[PDB]
């Protein structure tokens, strides 16, 4: 009768041709109907509501697979100078959507090899559009999800990996594949992420240190996974003083994750710690001192600042 949709598909002003119910006690409910449309405003208001998953009739599957197609096709044209917030909106929703069907289908070849082409395409947004980046780092992660935060960190990750010279298409779409899937160790995990690392209790602490090594052991045999990608979910947490989780120092690391992890370390402070944006890079230049390397955070800080 139903079929489940993400949010996070939803995005943008095309309207919908299709109506939407949300689940609550074991019943559903008409909440979003046909003509609604996400621009502006609208996108924190249903994103405020915290809703992971609503659910649309079968026999109007069809009409949301055209709104999705059509919301991506839209979204990644560079030629018809639509507004640019609107097109991070659908990029943003889309790769954290592509994320979470790896995250709840990590063995479906089909799945991961999506996201991968999507990562690919993600690159060339934020690296072509001069403000992508700016637009999508608009966009806050206020339900404090992995996916989310992929999404965020490979943001980050491609600016700097930009910044740093790397030209590379193959390493620009592995490295943003491994950001947007680096928490995968997290998934369905108990622990509150929405923390400050220095506050969480002992145990909260050790559940934390496991998210790389379990997140790299549930993929590292999956043939479809590339080991760039395995190697980021499970080397991001490492600090270049040895100081993560694994004690690995930068010497020992795919310089990819050191790239990682440094992005990671910065929306880490901003989503999960309560960091506001311009503060940030200061913070780990002082407070973070050597886990990661100066240049990266000051290529970070004038990522943040624009320059
Ligand atoms: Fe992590
Ligand atoms: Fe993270």
Redo the contacts with the bound molecule.
């Keep these: 009768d139903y079929v489940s949709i993400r949010v996070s598909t939803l995005r943008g002003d095309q309207k919908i041709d299709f109506n939407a119910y949300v689940k609550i006690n074991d019943k559903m409910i008409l909440y979003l109907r046909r003509g609604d449309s996400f621009e502006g405003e609208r996108l924190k208001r249903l994103k405020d509501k915290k809703l992971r998953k609503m659910y649309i009739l079968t026999d109007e599957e069809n009409s949301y697979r055209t709104y999705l197609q059509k919301n991506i096709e839209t979204a990644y044209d560079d030629t018809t100078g639509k507004d640019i917030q609107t097109r991070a909106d659908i990029i943003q929703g889309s790769q954290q959507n592509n994320a979470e069907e790896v995250f709840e289908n990590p063995e479906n070849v089909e799945s991961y090899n999506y996201c991968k082409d999507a990562a690919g395409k993600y690159v060339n947004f934020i690296m072509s559009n001069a403000q992508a980046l700016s637009a999508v780092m608009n966009i806050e992660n206020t339900d404090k999800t ?1 996916s989310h ?1 992929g999404v965020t ?1 490979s943001t980050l990750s491609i600016a700097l990996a930009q910044k740093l010279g790397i030209t590379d298409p193959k390493k620009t779409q592995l490295l943003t594949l491994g950001a947007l899937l ?2 995968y160790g997290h998934h369905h995990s108990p622990l509150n992420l929405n923390q400050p690392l220095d506050s969480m209790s002992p145990e909260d602490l050790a559940l934390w240190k496991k998210h790389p090594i379990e997140g790299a052991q549930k993929v590292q045999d999956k043939k479809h996974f590339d080991q760039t990608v395995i190697n980021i979910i499970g080397q ?1 947490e490492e600090t270049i003083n040895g100081t993560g989780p694994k004690g690995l120092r930068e010497k020992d690391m795919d310089p990819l994750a050191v790239l990682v992890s440094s992005a ?1 370390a910065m ?2 402070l901003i989503t999960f710690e309560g960091v506001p944006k311009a503060e940030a890079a200061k913070k780990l230049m002082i407070d973070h001192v050597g886990k990661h390397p100066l240049q990266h955070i000051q290529h970070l800080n004038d990522i943040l600042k624009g320059l």
């Design positions: 992995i935060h960190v680096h928490d991001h990671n929306d880490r």
